C-alpha cells in the first residue's frame, strides 16, 4: 500500500481470504474491521508514528489514542478472491480529539462498496484518565492530515453522529459468559477493538443473520474488557431490522459498550 | 500465488499483518495455521476442486483432517514476507497428506514446516471409508508420483501415537464456546479454533518465557456451533512438553488430543 501523491492519505489492496468469509462466501464485518485496522497501522507506519499510534510528544507524557466510537456502512461485502481497495486519512477535531475515516472500493469496478469513521480520544496510559489534545500534539499531527475538511460521512446530521441510548432490562435476546482467548488480544495484550464487534453480533438471532445482511453498525467504547473479564451481550429489536446493543461485565454489569445495527433483507 | 513450473505444488507470499502478531510482534501459530489453510484452498482452486472431486460430489463424500503437525523454527515479524509451498499425496486407501514448507522470502531459509492427514467421510452419515480407485486416479495427476515429505526423518515426531490425559489435569480452561468468527463458510468450527482452545490451558508464565516449537493435534469429533469445550493440559517433561485434551464440558466426549513442545526464549 502507499501514501497518495499529496501524502495526506493512504491506499492498500487486500485479496479476501477463504477463512475471512461467512455463509454467503463474502467478507464478515469482522474481516472488514480488521482490514480497516491494518490499513490504519500501515498509514501510521508510513508517516513515522509508532504502530503499537503515539507521536514523540505524547510518548514523553505517557499518552495514547483510544477509540471512543466506530461507525461502518457496507453497501456490498466483497466475495472470496475479490480485491478491495481501502483509502484512510486522519483529521483533527480541535481538542475534542482525532477522527480516522476509510472508503472501501471494488478494485475492478472502482465503485464505493463501504465507508467508516472512528472517533479517538487522548488518554494517559497508567491512570487511564481522558484529557484534551494538547497544543504541541496538534501541530505535529496536522502536517499528515488534510487542512480542508474531508468526511467519509459529510451529510449534515448523519447516522455516524447519533446519541445511542442504554438498553433496559429485560433484553429481547442475550449471549452470556463471552470470554476473550489469546487470538482476541493485540500485541500489547489488550482485547482487540474488533472482538467487541463480534460480541455485539453474538446476541443477534441466527434467523436475522440467515435472512438479512448487516448494512450499518455504530459502537461506543466506554471501558476495556481485560483478559480475565467475562461479558454478556444484550440486544432488543427497535423496529429493514434495527437493534439496540449493550455489552456489560457478567457480574456487576459494568457497561463496556453500546451500539445500534441496521440490517436489510437479502 | 501460483502452481510451480511442473504444476505439482503451489506457492504464495503473505505479508504478516498488525492484528496477526502476539506479544513478541511475531505471527501467532494460529496466524500460521490460517495461512496454511488459505494456501491449501488456493492450490485446490488452481487445479479445479471446490476439496471435493467430481466423484466425491456424486457420492456426497468430503476430506476431513485426522491430524495436523506444525514445527516453527522462527515466527515471521509483523511486516515480514513469508513464502509457503504446499503439495498433496495419496497414502493409498488410508487417505491423503497435505504438506507445507514455510520460508523467509528475503533469506530463502526454511522457517517452518507442516503436515496433515485427511480421511474420507460420508458428509451426511459422518462414516469414514477407504479411498476408492476412481478417487485415487483423479488425485494422482495433481500429486508428485515419487514421495515428497515435509518430514522425511526416520523417527519424526509427526507420526508418534498420542496418549489420553489422566484426570486430574494439571491446568484447565473451562466453558470455551465458538462465536460466528470461529465458523467457516459452511457453519462448521474452523480447524484453527481448536488449536486456539488447546493453547488456552497453557499457563501465561510458559507463554511469556517460551516459544512454541512443535504441536501435534488429532481431530476425533467436531465441536458443533452450540457445544461447549473444556481444555486440559499436563506437563510431561530447558524444553517444556505438555499433553493436551479438548472434551465437551458436559459428558466429557473427547474432541481432540495433542502434544506441544516449547523452548526458552
Ligand atoms: O482499531 C482500529 O484501528 C479500527 C477499529 C476497528 C473496529 C472497531 C474499532 C476500531 O477503531
Ligand atoms: O484446514 C486446513 O485446510 C488446514 C488445517 C489448519 C489447521 C489445522 C488443521 C488443518 O487441516
* Fold match flag (A2-161 vs A173-265): yes
The answer to whether the CB of B37 is under 6 A from ligand 2 is: yes
SS3 (DSSP) at A214? strand
Q: How far is the centre of ligand 1, averaged over its atoms, from the C-alpha of A222 (Å)?
A: 14
Rounded Cα distance, A67 and A182, in Å: 21
> For residue B187, which residues of chain A lie inside 8 Å, CB to CB?
23
Antiparallel, parallel or unpaired: β A173-178 and A231-237: antiparallel
Beta-ladder partners of A15: A83
Interacting residues of A158 by C-beta distance below 8 A, sequence separation 6+: none
Query: Distance between alpha carbon B60 and the CA centroid of its chain, in Å?
Result: 24
> Is A199 within 8 Å of B190 when comparing Cβ atoms?
no
Cα(B265)–Cα(B259) distance, integer angstroms: 19
| Residue A143 CB neighbours (<10 A) | 10
Place of cell 475479490: A82
Domain A173-265 adopts which CATH fold?
A: Thiol Ester Dehydrase; Chain A (3.10.129)
At B95, is the secondary structure helix, strand, or coil? coil
Say yes or no for a CB contact (<8 Å) between A189 and B18: no
CATH class of the domain defined by B171-264: alpha beta
Q: Which CATH number fits domain A2-161: 3.30.470.20, 3.90.550.10, 3.20.20.70, 3.10.129.10?
A: 3.10.129.10
- Alpha carbon distance A63, A43 (integer Å): 20
d(CA A99, CA A247): 24
Q: Which grid cell sits at B94?
A: 488410508
Contacts of A79 in chain B (CB under 8 A): none
Cα B163 to ligand 2 centroid, rounded to whole Å:
22
Strand, coil or helix: what is A155?
A: coil
Query: What is the Cα–Cα distance from A230 to B131, expressed in whole angstroms?
Result: 45
Contacts of A240 (CB under 8 A, 6+ apart): A215, A262, A263, A264, A265
How far apart CA B13 and CA B8 sit, in angstroms, is 18
Taking the alpha carbons of B203, B68, B60, A208 in that order, is the dihedral positive or negative? positive
Ligand nearest, relative to CA of residue B197? 2
CB contact under 8 A, B175 and A179: yes
Distance of alpha carbon A126 from alpha carbon A111, whole angstroms: 44
Which residues, 6+ apart, have CB-to-CB distance to A248 below 8 Å?
A: A231, A232, A234, A254, A255, A256
**Which of A19, A30, A189 lies nearest to residue B184, judging by beta carbons?**
A19
How was this structure determined? It was done by: X-ray
Architecture of domain B2-159: Roll (3.10)
Beta-carbon-side half-sphere exposure of residue B176 (alpha carbons within 13 Å): 27
**Spatial CA neighbour of A259 closest among A201, A213, A204, A220:** A220
Task: Write out the catalytic residue numbers of B.
Answer: 186, 188, 223
Q: Angle at Cα A244 formed by Cα A243 and Cα A248, nearest 5°? A: 135
CA-based nearest distance A189→chain B, Å: 7
How many Å apart are CA B143 and CA B99, to the nearest integer? 11
Ligand 2 lined by B40 (C-beta under 6 Å): yes
Are B214 and B70 in contact, with CB atoms under 8 Å apart?
A: yes
Query: CA B1 to CA B22: how far, in whole Å?
Result: 26
What's A192's DSSP letter? P
Query: In 10 A of CB A155, how many CB atoms?
Result: 9
Count the alpha carbons within 13 Å of B213 in the hemisphere toward its beta carbon.
Answer: 13
Check A202 against B183: CB less than 8 A apart.
Answer: no
- Domain parsing of chain A, residue ranges: 2-161, 173-265
Prior bond of B168 cis (ω within 30°) = yes
Amino acid at each position: 500500500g502507499s501514501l497518495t501523491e499529496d501524502g495526506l492519505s493512504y491506499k492498500e489492496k487486500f485479496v479476501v481470504r477463504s477463512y475471512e468469509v461467512g455463509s454467503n462466501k463474502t467478507a464478515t464485518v469482522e474481516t472488514i474491521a480488521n482490514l480497516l485496522q491494518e490499513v490504519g497501522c500501515n498509514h501510521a507506519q508510513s508517516v513515522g508514528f509508532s504502530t503499537d499510534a503515539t507521536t514523540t510528544t505524547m510518548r514523553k507524557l505517557h499518552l495514547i489514542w483510544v477509540t471512543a466510537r466506530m461507525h461502518i456502512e457496507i453497501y456490498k461485502y466483497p466475495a472470496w478472491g475479490d480485491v478491495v481497495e481501502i483509502e484512510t486519512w486522519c483529521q483533527s477535531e480541535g481538542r475534542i480529539g482525532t477522527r480516522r475515516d476509510w472508503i472501501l472500493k471494488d478494485s475492478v469496478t472502482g465503485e464505493v462498496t463501504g465507508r467508516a469513521t472512528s472517533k479517538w480520544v487522548m488518554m494517559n496510559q497508567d491512570t487511564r484518565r481522558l484529557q484534551k489534545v494538547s497544543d504541541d500534539v496538534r501541530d505535529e499531527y496536522l502536517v499528515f492530515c488534510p487542512q480542508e475538511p474531508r468526511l467519509a460521512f459529510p451529510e449534515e446530521n448523519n447516522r455516524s453522529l447519533k446519541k445511542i441510548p442504554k438498553l433496559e432490562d429485560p433484553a429481547q435476546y442475550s449471549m452470556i459468559g463471552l470470554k476473550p482467548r489469546r487470538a482476541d488480544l493485540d500485541m500489547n495484550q489488550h482485547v482487540n477493538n474488533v472482538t467487541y464487534i463480534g460480541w455485539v453480533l453474538e446476541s443477534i438471532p441466527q434467523e436475522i443473520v440467515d435472512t438479512h445482511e448487516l448494512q450499518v453498525i455504530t459502537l461506543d467504547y466506554r471501558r476495556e474488557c481485560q483478559q480475565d473479564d467475562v461479558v454478556d451481550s444484550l440486544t432488543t429489536t427497535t423496529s429493514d431490522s434495527q437493534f439496540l446493543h449493550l455489552l456489560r461485565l457478567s457480574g456487576d454489569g459494568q457497561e463496556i459498550n453500546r451500539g445500534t445495527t441496521l440490517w436489510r433483507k437479502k
